[PDB]
mmCIF file of C-alpha atoms in Angstrom:
data_model
loop_
_atom_site.group_PDB
_atom_site.id
_atom_site.type_symbol
_atom_site.label_atom_id
_atom_site.label_comp_id
_atom_site.label_asym_id
_atom_site.label_seq_id
_atom_site.Cartn_x
_atom_site.Cartn_y
_atom_site.Cartn_z
ATOM 1 C CA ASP J 23 -2.816 -19.649 -11.851
ATOM 2 C CA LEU J 24 0.269 -20.292 -9.697
ATOM 3 C CA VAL J 25 -1.003 -23.380 -7.971
ATOM 4 C CA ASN J 26 1.011 -26.615 -8.719
ATOM 5 C CA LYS J 27 3.800 -24.615 -10.394
ATOM 6 C CA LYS J 28 7.174 -24.023 -8.835
ATOM 7 C CA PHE J 29 7.278 -21.148 -6.483
ATOM 8 C CA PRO J 30 8.349 -18.211 -8.698
ATOM 9 C CA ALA J 31 11.157 -16.798 -6.466
ATOM 10 C CA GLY J 32 13.065 -15.124 -9.382
ATOM 11 C CA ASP J 33 15.681 -12.834 -7.916
ATOM 12 C CA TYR J 34 13.131 -11.289 -5.534
ATOM 13 C CA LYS J 35 14.238 -10.371 -2.074
ATOM 14 C CA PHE J 36 12.452 -9.321 1.051
ATOM 15 C CA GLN J 37 13.578 -7.615 4.225
ATOM 16 C CA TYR J 38 12.503 -8.335 7.651
ATOM 17 C CA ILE J 39 13.613 -7.661 11.135
ATOM 18 C CA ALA J 40 13.990 -10.411 13.511
ATOM 19 C CA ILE J 41 12.194 -10.321 16.808
ATOM 20 C CA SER J 42 13.824 -12.561 19.584
ATOM 21 C CA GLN J 43 12.177 -11.186 22.802
ATOM 22 C CA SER J 44 14.590 -12.634 24.451
ATOM 23 C CA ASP J 45 15.640 -9.100 24.239
ATOM 24 C CA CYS J 51 17.921 -1.835 17.296
ATOM 25 C CA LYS J 52 17.896 -4.873 15.024
ATOM 26 C CA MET J 53 18.236 -4.063 11.420
ATOM 27 C CA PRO J 54 16.729 -5.459 8.194
ATOM 28 C CA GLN J 55 17.929 -8.716 6.926
ATOM 29 C CA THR J 56 17.622 -9.271 3.246
ATOM 30 C CA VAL J 57 16.319 -12.760 2.409
ATOM 31 C CA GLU J 58 15.912 -14.149 -1.047
ATOM 32 C CA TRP J 59 12.616 -15.763 -1.753
ATOM 33 C CA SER J 60 14.431 -18.652 -3.458
ATOM 34 C CA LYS J 61 16.541 -19.288 -0.492
ATOM 35 C CA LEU J 62 13.699 -19.042 1.956
ATOM 36 C CA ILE J 63 11.700 -21.432 -0.191
ATOM 37 C CA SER J 64 14.463 -23.791 -1.016
ATOM 38 C CA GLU J 65 15.441 -23.961 2.707
ATOM 39 C CA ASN J 66 11.981 -24.420 4.123
ATOM 40 C CA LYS J 67 9.594 -27.241 3.160
ATOM 41 C CA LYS J 68 6.318 -25.735 4.224
ATOM 42 C CA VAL J 69 6.118 -21.956 3.899
ATOM 43 C CA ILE J 70 2.908 -19.970 4.254
ATOM 44 C CA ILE J 71 3.151 -16.491 2.621
ATOM 45 C CA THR J 72 0.393 -13.967 3.165
ATOM 46 C CA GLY J 73 0.147 -10.440 1.964
ATOM 47 C CA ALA J 74 -1.385 -7.567 3.819
ATOM 48 C CA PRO J 75 -2.175 -4.239 2.375
ATOM 49 C CA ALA J 76 -0.732 -2.175 5.214
ATOM 50 C CA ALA J 77 1.178 -2.553 8.439
ATOM 51 C CA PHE J 78 -0.828 -1.024 11.226
ATOM 52 C CA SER J 79 -4.033 -1.321 9.363
ATOM 53 C CA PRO J 80 -6.490 -0.536 12.194
ATOM 54 C CA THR J 81 -7.958 -3.253 14.305
ATOM 55 C CA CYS J 82 -11.393 -1.907 13.487
ATOM 56 C CA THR J 83 -10.946 -3.291 9.967
ATOM 57 C CA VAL J 84 -10.588 -6.669 8.659
ATOM 58 C CA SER J 85 -7.304 -8.381 8.850
ATOM 59 C CA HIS J 86 -6.247 -11.917 8.416
ATOM 60 C CA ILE J 87 -2.910 -11.414 10.041
ATOM 61 C CA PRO J 88 -4.032 -11.847 13.582
ATOM 62 C CA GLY J 89 -5.401 -15.287 12.585
ATOM 63 C CA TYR J 90 -2.004 -16.341 11.457
ATOM 64 C CA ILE J 91 -0.451 -15.174 14.661
ATOM 65 C CA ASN J 92 -3.071 -16.899 16.741
ATOM 66 C CA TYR J 93 -2.703 -20.137 14.906
ATOM 67 C CA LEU J 94 1.029 -19.763 14.503
ATOM 68 C CA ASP J 95 1.641 -22.491 17.062
ATOM 69 C CA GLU J 96 -0.712 -24.990 15.511
ATOM 70 C CA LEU J 97 0.707 -24.132 12.048
ATOM 71 C CA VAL J 98 4.264 -24.723 13.173
ATOM 72 C CA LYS J 99 3.961 -27.447 15.652
ATOM 73 C CA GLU J 100 0.927 -29.416 14.286
ATOM 74 C CA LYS J 101 0.974 -28.603 10.510
ATOM 75 C CA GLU J 102 4.714 -28.392 10.227
ATOM 76 C CA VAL J 103 4.863 -24.944 8.902
ATOM 77 C CA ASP J 104 8.345 -23.733 8.781
ATOM 78 C CA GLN J 105 7.896 -20.127 7.900
ATOM 79 C CA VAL J 106 4.920 -17.808 7.833
ATOM 80 C CA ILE J 107 5.907 -14.793 5.904
ATOM 81 C CA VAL J 108 3.538 -11.904 6.246
ATOM 82 C CA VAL J 109 4.217 -9.536 3.348
ATOM 83 C CA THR J 110 3.730 -5.858 3.072
ATOM 84 C CA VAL J 111 5.301 -3.163 1.044
ATOM 85 C CA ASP J 112 5.941 -1.305 4.304
ATOM 86 C CA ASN J 113 9.407 -0.600 5.478
ATOM 87 C CA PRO J 114 10.897 -3.340 7.649
ATOM 88 C CA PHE J 115 10.870 -1.375 10.896
ATOM 89 C CA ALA J 116 7.243 -0.497 10.449
ATOM 90 C CA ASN J 117 6.561 -4.202 9.740
ATOM 91 C CA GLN J 118 8.590 -5.232 12.769
ATOM 92 C CA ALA J 119 6.808 -2.741 14.900
ATOM 93 C CA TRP J 120 3.518 -4.047 13.608
ATOM 94 C CA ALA J 121 4.491 -7.549 14.219
ATOM 95 C CA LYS J 122 5.262 -6.751 17.844
ATOM 96 C CA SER J 123 2.057 -4.725 18.027
ATOM 97 C CA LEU J 124 0.337 -7.878 17.074
ATOM 98 C CA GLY J 125 2.175 -10.041 19.609
ATOM 99 C CA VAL J 126 4.895 -11.600 17.576
ATOM 100 C CA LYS J 127 7.673 -12.279 19.987
ATOM 101 C CA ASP J 128 9.771 -14.512 17.759
ATOM 102 C CA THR J 129 10.411 -14.453 14.079
ATOM 103 C CA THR J 130 11.794 -18.030 13.969
ATOM 104 C CA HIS J 131 8.808 -19.020 12.025
ATOM 105 C CA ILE J 132 6.974 -15.775 11.392
ATOM 106 C CA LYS J 133 8.550 -12.942 9.607
ATOM 107 C CA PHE J 134 6.864 -9.691 8.583
ATOM 108 C CA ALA J 135 8.553 -9.175 5.252
ATOM 109 C CA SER J 136 8.777 -5.943 3.346
ATOM 110 C CA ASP J 137 8.492 -6.403 -0.346
ATOM 111 C CA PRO J 138 9.939 -3.167 -1.428
ATOM 112 C CA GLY J 139 8.030 -1.583 -4.236
ATOM 113 C CA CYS J 140 5.537 -4.481 -4.136
ATOM 114 C CA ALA J 141 7.830 -6.115 -6.684
ATOM 115 C CA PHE J 142 7.512 -9.749 -5.585
ATOM 116 C CA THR J 143 3.725 -9.281 -4.818
ATOM 117 C CA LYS J 144 3.189 -7.593 -8.262
ATOM 118 C CA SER J 145 5.135 -10.373 -9.876
ATOM 119 C CA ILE J 146 2.483 -12.765 -8.690
ATOM 120 C CA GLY J 147 -0.330 -10.246 -9.398
ATOM 121 C CA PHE J 148 -1.374 -10.147 -5.751
ATOM 122 C CA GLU J 149 -0.679 -6.368 -5.568
ATOM 123 C CA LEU J 150 -3.145 -3.671 -4.641
ATOM 124 C CA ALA J 151 -3.203 -0.445 -6.687
ATOM 125 C CA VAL J 152 -3.804 2.365 -4.418
ATOM 126 C CA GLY J 153 -3.408 5.233 -6.925
ATOM 127 C CA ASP J 154 -0.737 6.838 -9.110
ATOM 128 C CA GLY J 155 1.154 3.602 -9.730
ATOM 129 C CA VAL J 156 1.502 3.000 -6.026
ATOM 130 C CA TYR J 157 1.099 -0.593 -5.041
ATOM 131 C CA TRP J 158 0.414 -2.076 -1.681
ATOM 132 C CA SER J 159 0.080 -5.813 -1.331
ATOM 133 C CA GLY J 160 -3.383 -7.056 -1.593
ATOM 134 C CA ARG J 161 -4.661 -9.564 0.813
ATOM 135 C CA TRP J 162 -3.736 -13.028 -0.162
ATOM 136 C CA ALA J 163 -2.242 -16.204 1.017
ATOM 137 C CA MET J 164 0.004 -18.683 -0.604
ATOM 138 C CA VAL J 165 1.199 -22.006 0.487
ATOM 139 C CA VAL J 166 4.427 -23.370 -0.885
ATOM 140 C CA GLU J 167 5.254 -26.946 -0.264
ATOM 141 C CA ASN J 168 8.622 -28.322 -1.248
ATOM 142 C CA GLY J 169 9.191 -25.462 -3.649
ATOM 143 C CA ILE J 170 5.712 -25.854 -5.101
ATOM 144 C CA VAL J 171 2.840 -23.547 -4.795
ATOM 145 C CA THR J 172 0.052 -25.609 -3.204
ATOM 146 C CA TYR J 173 -2.353 -22.656 -2.754
ATOM 147 C CA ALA J 174 -2.449 -19.145 -3.887
ATOM 148 C CA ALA J 175 -5.393 -16.839 -3.640
ATOM 149 C CA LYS J 176 -5.990 -13.162 -3.183
ATOM 150 C CA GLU J 177 -9.040 -11.305 -1.986
ATOM 151 C CA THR J 178 -11.123 -9.625 -4.666
ATOM 152 C CA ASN J 179 -11.748 -6.929 -2.100
ATOM 153 C CA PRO J 180 -8.772 -6.737 0.420
ATOM 154 C CA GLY J 181 -10.467 -3.865 2.209
ATOM 155 C CA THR J 182 -13.551 -6.045 3.239
ATOM 156 C CA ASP J 183 -12.579 -9.626 2.542
ATOM 157 C CA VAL J 184 -10.940 -12.207 4.526
ATOM 158 C CA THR J 185 -11.785 -15.423 2.875
ATOM 159 C CA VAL J 186 -9.241 -17.066 0.837
ATOM 160 C CA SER J 187 -6.326 -15.238 2.661
ATOM 161 C CA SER J 188 -7.451 -16.349 6.055
ATOM 162 C CA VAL J 189 -5.480 -18.799 8.120
ATOM 163 C CA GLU J 190 -8.688 -20.940 8.196
ATOM 164 C CA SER J 191 -8.547 -21.272 4.366
ATOM 165 C CA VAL J 192 -4.916 -21.887 4.454
ATOM 166 C CA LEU J 193 -5.209 -24.401 7.175
ATOM 167 C CA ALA J 194 -7.631 -26.310 5.000
ATOM 168 C CA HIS J 195 -4.647 -26.652 2.475
ATOM 169 C CA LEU J 196 -2.119 -27.671 5.082
ATOM 170 C CA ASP I 23 16.321 25.418 -6.364
ATOM 171 C CA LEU I 24 13.593 25.714 -3.804
ATOM 172 C CA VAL I 25 14.225 28.486 -1.310
ATOM 173 C CA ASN I 26 12.529 31.739 -2.094
ATOM 174 C CA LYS I 27 10.166 30.097 -4.521
ATOM 175 C CA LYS I 28 6.474 29.323 -4.199
ATOM 176 C CA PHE I 29 6.071 25.920 -2.538
ATOM 177 C CA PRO I 30 6.049 23.390 -5.364
ATOM 178 C CA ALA I 31 2.762 21.660 -4.475
ATOM 179 C CA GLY I 32 1.867 20.578 -7.906
ATOM 180 C CA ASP I 33 -0.968 18.045 -7.628
ATOM 181 C CA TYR I 34 0.919 16.250 -4.949
ATOM 182 C CA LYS I 35 -1.152 14.879 -2.190
ATOM 183 C CA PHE I 36 -0.388 13.292 1.047
ATOM 184 C CA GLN I 37 -2.324 11.212 3.481
ATOM 185 C CA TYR I 38 -2.397 11.267 7.201
ATOM 186 C CA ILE I 39 -4.538 9.988 9.899
ATOM 187 C CA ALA I 40 -5.634 12.368 12.523
ATOM 188 C CA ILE I 41 -4.822 11.816 16.195
ATOM 189 C CA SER I 42 -7.275 13.670 18.460
ATOM 190 C CA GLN I 43 -7.500 13.581 22.238
ATOM 191 C CA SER I 44 -10.430 11.131 21.802
ATOM 192 C CA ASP I 45 -7.833 8.542 20.609
ATOM 193 C CA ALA I 46 -4.277 9.580 21.561
ATOM 194 C CA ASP I 47 -3.296 6.358 23.520
ATOM 195 C CA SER I 48 -6.057 4.080 22.067
ATOM 196 C CA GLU I 49 -6.202 2.209 18.829
ATOM 197 C CA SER I 50 -7.681 4.513 16.241
ATOM 198 C CA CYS I 51 -10.187 3.602 13.535
ATOM 199 C CA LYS I 52 -9.759 6.671 11.370
ATOM 200 C CA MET I 53 -9.617 6.713 7.577
ATOM 201 C CA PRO I 54 -6.631 8.449 6.163
ATOM 202 C CA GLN I 55 -7.374 11.884 5.045
ATOM 203 C CA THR I 56 -5.892 12.808 1.678
ATOM 204 C CA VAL I 57 -4.715 16.430 1.596
ATOM 205 C CA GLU I 58 -3.146 18.108 -1.439
ATOM 206 C CA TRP I 59 -0.057 19.906 -0.463
ATOM 207 C CA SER I 60 -1.496 23.035 -2.209
ATOM 208 C CA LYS I 61 -4.320 22.808 0.173
ATOM 209 C CA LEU I 62 -2.064 22.450 3.094
ATOM 210 C CA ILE I 63 0.028 25.387 2.092
ATOM 211 C CA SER I 64 -2.999 27.510 1.138
ATOM 212 C CA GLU I 65 -4.443 27.104 4.580
ATOM 213 C CA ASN I 66 -1.392 27.401 6.691
ATOM 214 C CA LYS I 67 0.803 30.504 6.713
ATOM 215 C CA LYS I 68 3.674 28.697 8.411
ATOM 216 C CA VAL I 69 4.542 25.184 7.771
ATOM 217 C CA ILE I 70 7.411 22.890 8.509
ATOM 218 C CA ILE I 71 7.700 19.888 6.344
ATOM 219 C CA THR I 72 10.191 17.348 7.243
ATOM 220 C CA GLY I 73 10.929 14.074 5.629
ATOM 221 C CA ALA I 74 12.104 10.865 7.300
ATOM 222 C CA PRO I 75 13.317 7.708 5.691
ATOM 223 C CA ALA I 76 11.149 5.290 7.722
ATOM 224 C CA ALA I 77 8.329 5.214 10.161
ATOM 225 C CA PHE I 78 9.443 3.224 13.068
ATOM 226 C CA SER I 79 13.147 3.671 12.260
ATOM 227 C CA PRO I 80 14.742 2.269 15.279
ATOM 228 C CA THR I 81 14.932 4.364 18.309
ATOM 229 C CA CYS I 82 18.649 3.719 18.511
ATOM 230 C CA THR I 83 19.269 5.319 15.021
ATOM 231 C CA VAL I 84 19.650 9.090 14.676
ATOM 232 C CA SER I 85 16.394 10.834 13.797
ATOM 233 C CA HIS I 86 15.299 14.441 13.631
ATOM 234 C CA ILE I 87 11.689 13.699 14.407
ATOM 235 C CA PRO I 88 11.751 13.572 18.143
ATOM 236 C CA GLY I 89 13.082 17.097 18.198
ATOM 237 C CA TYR I 90 10.098 18.242 16.198
ATOM 238 C CA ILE I 91 7.901 16.634 18.572
ATOM 239 C CA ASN I 92 9.676 17.979 21.707
ATOM 240 C CA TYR I 93 9.821 21.399 20.261
ATOM 241 C CA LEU I 94 6.357 21.239 18.908
ATOM 242 C CA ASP I 95 4.712 23.471 21.550
ATOM 243 C CA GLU I 96 7.428 26.037 21.044
ATOM 244 C CA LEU I 97 7.025 25.910 17.264
ATOM 245 C CA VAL I 98 3.260 26.304 17.514
ATOM 246 C CA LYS I 99 3.058 28.669 20.500
ATOM 247 C CA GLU I 100 6.266 30.714 19.949
ATOM 248 C CA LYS I 101 7.000 30.444 16.271
ATOM 249 C CA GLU I 102 3.423 30.389 15.051
ATOM 250 C CA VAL I 103 4.014 27.221 13.158
ATOM 251 C CA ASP I 104 0.730 26.092 11.891
ATOM 252 C CA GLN I 105 1.793 22.653 10.823
ATOM 253 C CA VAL I 106 4.627 20.339 11.136
ATOM 254 C CA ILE I 107 4.244 17.750 8.507
ATOM 255 C CA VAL I 108 6.385 14.687 8.912
ATOM 256 C CA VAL I 109 6.713 12.953 5.575
ATOM 257 C CA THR I 110 7.463 9.416 4.876
ATOM 258 C CA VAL I 111 6.543 7.045 2.109
ATOM 259 C CA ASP I 112 5.063 4.684 4.653
ATOM 260 C CA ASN I 113 1.370 4.083 4.735
ATOM 261 C CA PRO I 114 -0.666 6.438 6.722
ATOM 262 C CA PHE I 115 -1.539 3.915 9.313
ATOM 263 C CA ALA I 116 2.088 3.033 10.039
ATOM 264 C CA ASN I 117 2.758 6.689 10.155
ATOM 265 C CA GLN I 118 -0.011 7.467 12.501
ATOM 266 C CA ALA I 119 1.074 4.618 14.771
ATOM 267 C CA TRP I 120 4.568 5.894 14.552
ATOM 268 C CA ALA I 121 3.377 9.289 15.503
ATOM 269 C CA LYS I 122 1.687 7.833 18.491
ATOM 270 C CA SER I 123 4.709 5.888 19.396
ATOM 271 C CA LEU I 124 6.602 9.114 19.409
ATOM 272 C CA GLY I 125 4.046 10.616 21.773
ATOM 273 C CA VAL I 126 1.972 12.582 19.232
ATOM 274 C CA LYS I 127 -1.480 12.925 20.935
ATOM 275 C CA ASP I 128 -2.781 15.559 18.721
ATOM 276 C CA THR I 129 -2.356 16.242 14.920
ATOM 277 C CA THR I 130 -3.782 19.749 14.952
ATOM 278 C CA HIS I 131 -0.330 21.047 14.342
ATOM 279 C CA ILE I 132 1.668 17.984 13.484
ATOM 280 C CA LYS I 133 0.756 15.407 10.995
ATOM 281 C CA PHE I 134 2.641 12.330 9.919
ATOM 282 C CA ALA I 135 2.035 12.345 6.228
ATOM 283 C CA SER I 136 2.405 9.604 3.752
ATOM 284 C CA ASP I 137 3.832 10.598 0.504
ATOM 285 C CA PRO I 138 2.892 7.528 -1.393
ATOM 286 C CA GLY I 139 5.663 6.278 -3.809
ATOM 287 C CA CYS I 140 7.709 9.199 -2.534
ATOM 288 C CA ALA I 141 6.242 11.313 -5.358
ATOM 289 C CA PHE I 142 6.286 14.576 -3.694
ATOM 290 C CA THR I 143 9.593 13.947 -2.101
ATOM 291 C CA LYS I 144 11.077 12.835 -5.312
ATOM 292 C CA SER I 145 9.626 15.870 -6.956
ATOM 293 C CA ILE I 146 11.845 18.103 -4.706
ATOM 294 C CA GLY I 147 14.788 15.780 -5.074
ATOM 295 C CA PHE I 148 14.719 14.900 -1.313
ATOM 296 C CA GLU I 149 14.196 11.234 -1.618
ATOM 297 C CA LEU I 150 16.526 8.404 -0.729
ATOM 298 C CA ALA I 151 16.933 5.553 -3.072
ATOM 299 C CA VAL I 152 17.129 2.270 -1.255
ATOM 300 C CA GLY I 153 17.255 -0.417 -3.880
ATOM 301 C CA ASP I 154 15.625 -1.348 -7.255
ATOM 302 C CA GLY I 155 13.692 1.887 -7.940
ATOM 303 C CA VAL I 156 12.387 2.120 -4.397
ATOM 304 C CA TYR I 157 12.493 5.520 -2.835
ATOM 305 C CA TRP I 158 12.177 6.428 0.735
ATOM 306 C CA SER I 159 12.192 10.000 1.759
ATOM 307 C CA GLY I 160 15.488 11.406 2.622
ATOM 308 C CA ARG I 161 15.902 13.255 5.838
ATOM 309 C CA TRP I 162 15.051 16.850 5.142
ATOM 310 C CA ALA I 163 13.288 19.849 6.458
ATOM 311 C CA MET I 164 11.525 22.710 4.823
ATOM 312 C CA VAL I 165 9.818 25.803 5.933
ATOM 313 C CA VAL I 166 7.048 27.289 3.897
ATOM 314 C CA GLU I 167 5.883 30.777 4.989
ATOM 315 C CA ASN I 168 2.952 32.287 3.158
ATOM 316 C CA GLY I 169 3.385 29.824 0.339
ATOM 317 C CA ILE I 170 7.054 30.410 -0.116
ATOM 318 C CA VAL I 171 9.776 27.961 0.667
ATOM 319 C CA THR I 172 11.968 29.801 3.225
ATOM 320 C CA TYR I 173 14.344 26.846 4.001
ATOM 321 C CA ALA I 174 14.808 23.529 2.376
ATOM 322 C CA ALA I 175 17.630 21.214 3.306
ATOM 323 C CA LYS I 176 18.200 17.454 2.798
ATOM 324 C CA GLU I 177 20.817 15.530 4.789
ATOM 325 C CA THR I 178 23.603 14.066 2.564
ATOM 326 C CA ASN I 179 23.634 10.854 4.710
ATOM 327 C CA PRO I 180 20.165 10.624 6.275
ATOM 328 C CA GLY I 181 21.344 7.406 7.737
ATOM 329 C CA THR I 182 23.751 9.361 9.946
ATOM 330 C CA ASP I 183 23.153 13.144 9.829
ATOM 331 C CA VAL I 184 20.712 15.186 11.753
ATOM 332 C CA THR I 185 21.977 18.647 10.887
ATOM 333 C CA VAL I 186 20.006 20.702 8.406
ATOM 334 C CA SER I 187 16.849 18.584 8.827
ATOM 335 C CA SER I 188 16.953 19.211 12.597
ATOM 336 C CA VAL I 189 14.436 21.190 14.328
ATOM 337 C CA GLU I 190 17.272 23.314 15.659
ATOM 338 C CA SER I 191 18.496 24.277 12.260
ATOM 339 C CA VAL I 192 14.884 24.943 11.347
ATOM 340 C CA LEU I 193 14.216 26.899 14.490
ATOM 341 C CA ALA I 194 17.089 29.024 13.451
ATOM 342 C CA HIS I 195 15.125 30.100 10.281
ATOM 343 C CA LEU I 196 11.771 30.777 11.714
#
């Protein structure tokens, strides 16, 4: 592959719930095409499951920790964390991870894994159920600069990690 | 269809993560257990199964789940409910966290089950379409006594109704 091709938004939509904090929000639908057309530097990273336990690997906390560097120093407009979980759960997870502001980091639901499947970064979990795998993607000016998924999302944080991504920023 | 028929377990399985007293307010590192519904029913005379559309549905929105949790002691202690199974299509970790966020400190008698891809819930027609072939569970309750569905009811607008899915409506059938 996707690298150096236009970001394949198609008609795919994600939902997320803002966090202001800065003090019952509800899911906003956002078109990938709009998000990508409206934002020059977008990091998108898939996670298999909201509330995956801390005792297992996760790349997401890296993204949260480096959020400030990404946004201030590396001019990242939007970090979209993508799961197939419902948007409330993804919101709750985001807060659980210390997201206090979704200006630049949104925990997107990709309902039915459809966007994630469409780029082949899905994770079959049985019976035609798809979670997202673990992957990261950099889109720059509508172009996929970087797209990689873990071969084993359950143990691997390599190509999806913020460090790897940061290397492509 | 369902009332007064054997619980239609089929091959449907759910997943849940246990919450014991060793981890009720701590972050858990438990693998989801997969449990076939036939196994649940087989081992528990008296089971309440109730679907919800979304783990972590906002606390400002109407939900039947808190009632199940508040009535849980009564259900177990006075109504001999063996299990309350709260079903969503959300991942078992989300569900377990949700359970914790609702005060569940013990899954002995209540479990927040994942019904992946809404397959079981669809199978009983109690789902909630939410766009593009995506199904959440509707809001519904069901009582299974000795393998037999004694009560099954889905809200018409799960968004807004907590009537037949409510623990009170259920209580009034136990």
